[PDB]
Write a protein that binds this DNA or RNA. Structure first.
Ligand code: OGA
Ligand code: OGA
Ligand code: OGA
Ligand code: OGA
Ligand code: MN
Ligand code: MN
Ligand code: MN
Ligand code: MN
Lengths: 372, 381, 377, 378
DNA sequence: CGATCAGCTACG
DNA sequence: CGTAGCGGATCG
DNA sequence: CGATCAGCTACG
DNA sequence: CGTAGCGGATCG
């Protein structure tokens, strides 16, 4: 599969670049691969390398380990319960380093050097941001696409807060607010009992979702390369899971479609969700494995984006081009209303795909693995 | 059709000659057929029989199957990526029969087979008889000494660049062509009865531009070498008989069925003077060849290279076999061009190469399945 | 657990000695581990390293892959069908390296590999140090001199009968006629095992091993260093199989919900110095040409022959070979692929066969691994 | 796959037995195979050899070729049209060897070019195997809520609700009265196209999909009988036998030719037959017909059993009636030869082994032309 | 997302 | 006469 | 459909 | 003690 080869090249090249920035000997790309043939990809990798090196040089530490924090969590603690969240705040305080709105790349590590949060502002190069803007605009401006049909279905008529109307941007939008999800292997609502299959959004071979994916393979390669810089075992394990889902047709239904989607799937993650013109309340993401690091990319036409992490006592500037990697099941996070239109791409995981593929899900990486 | 009958009979006769060499009961050509009508072809078939039997008795094996190698290759992996080639070389090494401390240049006819007895490479030095080599030399000289043929027109088309590693257009890069004193104009021409323009595999195929003038230089070169092409086709039938017969069937369907090609009477006229089971033939005059894989043909296609000219130091390099092969005039090499990395450095003189290769979409159009590579034992049946 | 620690360390040390022999920088054992605690084991490992390196330098190749050979075999093709064996011999011949110009019997260490570098057969003559051979001779003698041990009790049970095919392993045609110091017969040992036809219950301890101080448990206690040696050899030939067998034993020891009578099985494992599933002792029996069909396709079995005989031969027809099979000789082979037999010898002989049960791997949740390629050692 | 090896061994051994009967040098089975290990199979092969050798010595010839007959037939001419059948009877008469009661001796009908069109084999099946088949069919037709009883109540319900295009399940044909075995029709196949789903990829027959349903265990009860039938076919038409085996191997190997290929592979693993399909017709009379759903060149095999005394199979274009009592085997080009079986004085079942050419096309295996009888004697 | 492609005729 | 403008699924 | 199976507790 | 009767998916 050449797509997985491309994502490997992006990841490896990004690592060489970061190493060059650290040693003072600049990496010079000579190999004849996709990176030399596509300056947009090369430039985007260079920008991500700059931001990642800066973030790796600015590390805050909380006075507890992710393991104990996760053991105090209940299996579906998403942050709606104020009593238990106060319990968490007292048992796992921010610590002396964290007792201001940040703008500089940084990361939060636990007492045993595990990365819980990586803040990367302006990680995505303007070319790729333009590309993503165009793709999302095409998906959210179609007349009878999934988003418009859902948008009129909801006008005719927490708990399922991800599609609550109070959270969507009300006023002037050229992009249709809503939420869509894409994955080569997914279990539909209350179909979790069966084998996984392709997401409905991706099932038409020339539907709006498949073309949206075809519009952003280089953005997805960039996001995957960032993940590989932060957690290489997780990147490689996701790639192995994808390879196994491709090979072994007895793990999915409609495996023809799953294999095609994988062929145009330039990402090590299990799934990608697009949230258009919706505020995000403080929450924990409960649907993935404890150990999964998700990646958020925000874009649009706004100036006052903020991401709030209360258990770190921090607010982070969350403007177009900003990338955030985080343990979504551990870190409470939210994004208030912005002064304009916004979209978010959330790249995340399904542990059940991992056991099905026979690939262990790894524990979060320590930051020192960066420097080997 | 006399062309397809001629090459079919040449193939069958060559097989009988090789079998006689194997059993010790010499074949003696008795039938009153086209092979009796051309003593030159018969002599050349005997020489090919000698060299083919020798190569069939000297077989190296790599410790992997072509099928797994191809599954690891990407569809357009031509060898430009050195890191990817290092991955390939470590996952599919030459094996104990082929690794050595020092680079080995072979001189004896041989073949490389995979772990499942499929032929990947066949080395046949001095396969072509002096007579047929003389003929080919004369025909290629006629093509490359012309005053306003395709070769000089191409040399002028690049005249703006000239007076001013693979990559786009490497087959005609000026870096590779012979600088100095040449009797034959360096360049590349290609011939085919049915063919698709680059990027245009969406229409119906048509005749190659070189062959469209009914008395142009290309059709006249083609008419000059029907017995050399019969010999090349017969060799192919010895290495991969199903591919030979399937190519012949494809040609027959393209000839008969007129709704498969554009300009079909021209395609039929070319097929009538097409003494070859292959889809296409390319003539490369005075050009070195860098290490590459040919990525545009079917995975399972066996291509045939014939080299000639007046040079003494010819070498063909196969890195994934850890081998260099003496590649002097008259040498024939059959190889899975989409699997085998191969290149030819500059020689100390003038050289030309005839590359016979395939287009799977022609097989699809003709309704003929493309077969999987032959096992060597099928020769011995 | 000292059993698994001893065999793991023996395997690692043997690998280091073989590596030193290959590079020319001799391994020198400095660590304070199990190997220093047993100089006899260390000596035997050095001898095995020498013979293994010699065998690795003398490699014959068959012109086919084990995968294609096995795909043409039927799951219980033991060699009884002469037509089917002719089919196999014609479709999978010995090849040019094996058929043309060698002696009546081989005497030098060697191995047969397939077209994809997988090991099919490893001939290792004089592999066992004389000390360990003495030890095994004594333990097998102790098992075969008892009044009313299992060996004598089965010899009596064949009463009126005396006055391939089912039960060939104990056919009377094969056992030594005359006067024997050792009682001919067959015994089998395993920490977890299924009775024939009963792979539908939980596995339990081998019958021979259940008395806490019976003859079988003391034969096991007498040969821990011979078993550690055999296990280390196996790890040199197929490292994934060694480590996976060790994991299976570890799971059977830990997880008590896999076994019946799990305390007893735990004791057996504690004195089980071997990664193999099971061990069979064949005393004074010739062996007809056969394939062992009951184990996993990819399982490497190990045969050890001993006794006081001079004309021992192991016949592998599909390799066109006869191998000198005298006391101290070790043979590793894919029992499901390689036809092999041992004719009657001019004296008394015993064989220790170490082999596998794939259902054990399934029960322990450990996948059965693919055979290693020979270069990986 | 050991199943295909078993049927190959049965075919080869049967041929050796027939050769021994012809030369006068009896075959002696020495090989250590399934035939030596199973005396029931060996005895049954011996009986089939006796009857087949007798049938090959009694050959009638019609004065036309099967090819011209098929060329004059229309693609769905099943015999319902009396005008077309009168035309066929004038253009292809029985001929001087056949025009002129009920035959009882094993025989065969060949065409003007020695192709076998019909082989009559009375008491071909050994009593042991007939007992076995009786028991398996009785088990199939007595299951409490199995396919046959659910069909039969679907039939009573529709007859009651009322106050050929589906003649094979027409209610007039089934035995009315006292039956131990539930009348009906079932069909089994590893690769099959359901009604309404004939432009999809082939898949396993509905009857065989439950891994321990009544259909799969009926198949598990009669592998030795299925091996016997395949061996008979291999004696009459060896290329067809071997081509059916090749099609089965391709369907087993190539997982992209079928849906639910897991199930198809399991079924193939217990499919002891070179035929594409097997149908069981329990307690049903059979009107004169041609079978139109198979390849023109396909030779089907019928095995009849039960407890009846007056069984007859009618072939009008040969001007013949054939005694069709329990144990009788008939091989015939069902798409060419009109044939029918009247109601009998008791309970009866029929096992019909037949072909689907589309499976051969999918597997890339040509369907061969019917064998000539002389191929037996090579 | 820029590049790949064993080439060609329409047309200045 | 020469050469511009393809042409389009797919490749890393 | 009879045979295979590197064996064993339940019990006269 | 000694040994009868398993035991069941699968093999040709
Ligand atoms: O909307 C954003 O920027 C962040 N979104 C999330 O964390 C989410 O949807 O789970
Ligand atoms: O130049 C040679 O002899 C060989 N040439 C090639 O393989 C080629 O042009 O693709
Ligand atoms: O007797 C020997 O030395 C070898 N024995 C075997 O292979 C066996 O019992 O299966
Ligand atoms: O019922 C019988 O014996 C014969 N049956 C058939 O020919 C049939 O159903 O097509
Ligand atoms: Mn979230
Ligand atoms: Mn080439
Ligand atoms: Mn054995
Ligand atoms: Mn019928």
């Amino acid at each position: 599969l050449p797509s997985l080869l491309l994502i490997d090249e992006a990841a490896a090249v990004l690592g060489r670049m970061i190493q060059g920035l650290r040693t003072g000997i600049p990496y010079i790309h000579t190999e004849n691969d996709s990176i030399k043939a596509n300056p947009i990809l090369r430039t985007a990798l260079w920008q991500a390398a700059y931001v990642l090196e800066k973030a790796y040089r600015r590390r805050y530490r909380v006075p507890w380990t992710a393991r104990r924090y996760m053991r105090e969590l209940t299996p579906r603690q998403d942050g709606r319960n104020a009593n238990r969240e106060a319990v968490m705040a007292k048992e796992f305080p921010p610590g002396a380093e964290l007792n201001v709105q940040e703008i500089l790349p940084a990361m939060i590590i636990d007492a045993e050097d595990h990365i819980l949060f990586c803040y990367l502002p302006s990680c995505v190069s303007p070319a790729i941001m333009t590309i993503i803007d165009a793709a999302v605009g095409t998906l959210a401006t179609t007349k009878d696409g999934h988003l418009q049909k859902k948008s009129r279905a909801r006008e005719g008529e927490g708990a399922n807060w991800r599609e609550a109307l109070d959270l969507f941007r009300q006023g002037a939008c050229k992009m249709t607010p809503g939420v869509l999800t894409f994955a080569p292997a997914w279990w539909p609502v209350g179909h979790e009992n069966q084998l996984p299959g392709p997401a409905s959004t991706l099932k038409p071979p020339k539907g709006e979702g498949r073309m949206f994916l075809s519009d952003i393979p280089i953005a997805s390669a960039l996001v995957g390369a960032i993940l590989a810089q932060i957690n290489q075992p997780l990147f490689e394990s996701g790639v192995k899971v994808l390879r196994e889902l491709y090979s072994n047709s007895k793990l999915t239904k409609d495996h023809s479609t799953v294999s095609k989607i994988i062929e145009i799937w330039f990402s090590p993650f299990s799934s990608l969700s697009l949230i258009v013109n919706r505020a995000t309340p403080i929450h924990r993401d409960t649907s993935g494995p404890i150990e999964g690091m998700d990646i958020l990319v925000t874009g649009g036409n706004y100036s006052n984006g903020v991401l709030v992490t209360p258990s770190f006592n921090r607010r982070w500037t969350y403007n177009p081009g900003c990338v955030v990697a985080l343990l979504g099941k551990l870190v409470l996070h939210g994004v208030p209303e912005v002064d304009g239109e916004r979209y978010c791409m959330a790249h995340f995981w399904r542990e059940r795909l991992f056991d099905a593929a026979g690939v262990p899900f790894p524990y979060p990486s320590k930051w020192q693995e960066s420097y080997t």
